[PDB]
Swiss-Prot record, chain A:
Subcellular location: Nucleus
Protein name (record): Mediator of RNA polymerase II transcription subunit 23
UniProt family annotation: Belongs to the Mediator complex subunit 23 family.
Subunit structure: Component of the Mediator complex, which is composed of MED1, MED4, MED6, MED7, MED8, MED9, MED10, MED11, MED12, MED13, MED13L, MED14, MED15, MED16, MED17, MED18, MED19, MED20, MED21, MED22, MED23, MED24, MED25, MED26, MED27, MED29, MED30, MED31, CCNC, CDK8 and CDC2L6/CDK11. The MED12, MED13, CCNC and CDK8 subunits form a distinct module termed the CDK8 module. Mediator containing the CDK8 module is less active than Mediator lacking this module in supporting transcriptional activation.
Lineage, uppermost ranks: Eukaryota, Metazoa, Chordata, Craniata, Vertebrata
Biological role stated in the UniProt entry: Component of the Mediator complex, a coactivator involved in the regulated transcription of nearly all RNA polymerase II-dependent genes. Mediator functions as a bridge to convey information from gene-specific regulatory proteins to the basal RNA polymerase II transcription machinery. Mediator is recruited to promoters by direct interactions with regulatory proteins and serves as a scaffold for the assembly of a functional pre-initiation complex with RNA polymerase II and the general transcription factors.
Signal peptide: none
Region of the whole protein represented: 978 to 1334 of 1367
Naturally occurring in which organism (per UniProt): Mus musculus (Mouse)
Swiss-Prot record, chain B:
Entry similarity comment: Belongs to the Mediator complex subunit 24 family.
Span covered, complete protein: 248 to 741 of 987
Gene source species: Mus musculus (Mouse)
Protein name, entry field: Mediator of RNA polymerase II transcription subunit 24
Motif placement: LXXLL motif 2: 97-101
Known role: Component of the Mediator complex, a coactivator involved in the regulated transcription of nearly all RNA polymerase II-dependent genes. Mediator functions as a bridge to convey information from gene-specific regulatory proteins to the basal RNA polymerase II transcription machinery. Mediator is recruited to promoters by direct interactions with regulatory proteins and serves as a scaffold for the assembly of a functional preinitiation complex with RNA polymerase II and the general transcription factors. Required for basal and activator-dependent transcription.
Taxonomic lineage: Eukaryota, Metazoa, Chordata, Craniata, Vertebrata
Motif annotated as LXXLL motif 3, chain positions: 193-197
Superkingdom per UniProt: Eukaryota
Amino acid sequence: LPVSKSLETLLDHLGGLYKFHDRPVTYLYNTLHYYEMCLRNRDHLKRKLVHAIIGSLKDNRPQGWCLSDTYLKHAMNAREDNPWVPEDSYYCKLIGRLVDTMAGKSPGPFPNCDWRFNEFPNPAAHALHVTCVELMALAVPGKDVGNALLNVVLKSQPLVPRENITAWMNAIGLIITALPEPYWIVLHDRIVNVISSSSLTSETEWVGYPFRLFDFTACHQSYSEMSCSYTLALAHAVWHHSSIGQLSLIPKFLTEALLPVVKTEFQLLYVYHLVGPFLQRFQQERTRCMIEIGVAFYDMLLNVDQCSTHLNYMDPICDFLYHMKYMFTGDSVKEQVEKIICNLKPALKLRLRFITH
Amino acid sequence: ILLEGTMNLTGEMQPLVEQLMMVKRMQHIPTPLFVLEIWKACFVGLIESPEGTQELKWTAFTYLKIPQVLVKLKKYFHGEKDFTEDVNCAFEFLLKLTPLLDKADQRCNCDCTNFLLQECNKQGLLSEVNFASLVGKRTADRDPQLKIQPNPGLILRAEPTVTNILKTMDADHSKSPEGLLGVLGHMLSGKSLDLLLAAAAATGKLKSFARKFINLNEFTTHGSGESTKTASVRALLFDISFLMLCHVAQTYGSEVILSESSSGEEVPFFETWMQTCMPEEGKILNPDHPCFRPDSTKVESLVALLNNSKLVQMKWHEACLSISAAILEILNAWENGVLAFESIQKITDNIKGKVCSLAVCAVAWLVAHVRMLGLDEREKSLQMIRQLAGPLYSENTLQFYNERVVIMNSILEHMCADVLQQTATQIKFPSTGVDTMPYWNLLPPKRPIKEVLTDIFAKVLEKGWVDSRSIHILDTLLHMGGVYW
């Protein structure tokens, strides 16, 4: 750890030398790929190192910061008191600038000098600047950070308006795409933990109609906006932009976690909508994982078959699987699903009869 | 339901009830889902569209749907699940719409508690065998969600709750169908807001309240007395009663004048109370029909404006005879030039304390005279001067209610003069209020009528409700063109 005592001196004499480039994201992300699980105690000394790292950020005078200065001021005296809670609201303010990227007045004094070498093809890249180093000093990372990032959805923020939540969730996904693993992996566990399983098995309510609930754009009315559905879009949100290599995470995330949590059928439709509309990304690049996605589908099918009095929405799942087969799996998995498809209910057997070919 | 809750908030004894009955007959709607739908309609209101006085109208309609649903429980179902568990499962269902109540609380800043109070009111009205435990279970999920903040500011009494509570004592205000009492009973009304009228909008007292004030006006002919204090008290009482009547007219109109002119062998001054402001000009009509002005007191207003130095003796006849006043005003201001600046002095004299009806007549006659080429615009500047803060305790105004009186004068000037504030240059903003009536024509001038489809229908189809606010627009669209096209 005493290497800290060294580094804080270096910039203190060579900080101004940094006035030629500023990309701390790619320069800092690798420094915590697996150190978090063991940096916590040493993270106390990071409580100093952040005040050094932001010092490197201090070597810039383009007049390009007018709201992060609030964080700066509220992070200069007794840093172990103020910035825990209100950061959530602050986060909104931050993501406000994000949703201020399109039609608002942010393209004023924010960008200057000269849209040429300050990494400005889009001001969105300015968002990821501090997100990680915000509260990495204390035990805030791991769980609290993800909860904080997701509070903007399940709870109605005051500034959050109900006509453009789409762009909001989009920006949240854009941010999430630039955060370390645990921050956006704890999100999945929180989603599947209780939201997909509040009670949902004995008798949820007469609202158990899956389609109207699980479909989005219902927020266009001031009703039909049950929290769970929101979370759904949340996933879509990140998967609307993190669709490059992060999908390799969901098969494992499925294989165990989604197995002993599903009893009824609308939970199946929920997890389907969660994983469904992305098979193209696997057919293109992650070809090895689509087979796992399919066998997971069929495992959900066998599970809901073994634990059910009767299937109420047979034809939906039927033509769903029809689409998935005829359009994405081709003719590969045909054998494996057989070893499951034979031991289904007679009605379901006759219903899926033509899957044999 | 939104439609009916937007047009006729009052006067709804049971047209809405029979309409729901017939649409239930001409459909397949399970009663649980039906009560769910009506409750969702009540909850969705007061949130999106209104921001001012209309919010009180919305909450009144919501808490008026409760006797409606009571009569529904009484006469709709019979011998087939007579409200045994329908309301129970309905409340259970709507409890799953937690973000709706979250937004409602965020909006009203007290709706979370107000929801509890209205639920207890429904229980006191509807079936409350054991559903109080359901309300408790729902609160057990609601409250923990809400335990830099909006709670610090709002800590006082919640305005919807206080209104709906005090409505009980408001319906039984005095229970005295007579007059000659103290003005104190009405003085408290001058301090409070239109919350009294908001409660009255529940159709429980509106008719009786209008009848009471009508009898007070028809009775307060001030007899023949000389007690300056008592005469001024009665004058202020008459002024406040007429202001309340005009405000009720501006709010709802037809129902009040109907309740006042339904039965009885009499003829009070219903002309100046039914020809002031409405979706009908009748401008030159006032010089035509009601201009029967005999020589009796014809120069009374003239001598008054000449030697006001106006509240000497109780006399209210210039209201129906301010025609001579307006004629002299226009002839002296610029038509003939009898008075360059003395016209403003005479107007200020006519703007003396305890006199508010004069402003009403002036505004009405300005609206009558705007039918000219607007080349003189004398009445515009006249009304502008009248609406000013001129009477700053100049005369011995023994009113002590100039604040509320001036607020009523401002809101009445706001509701009328719409055409004059449109056909001419915009006013210099003499309001200094909070939020005026947002509901207006809102028809894009340099755009044709062929916009209803692509602006309203596509959205409302993509949306989940009828967009109540836009409905107002639709109404203007209805009686503007033809039903055919």
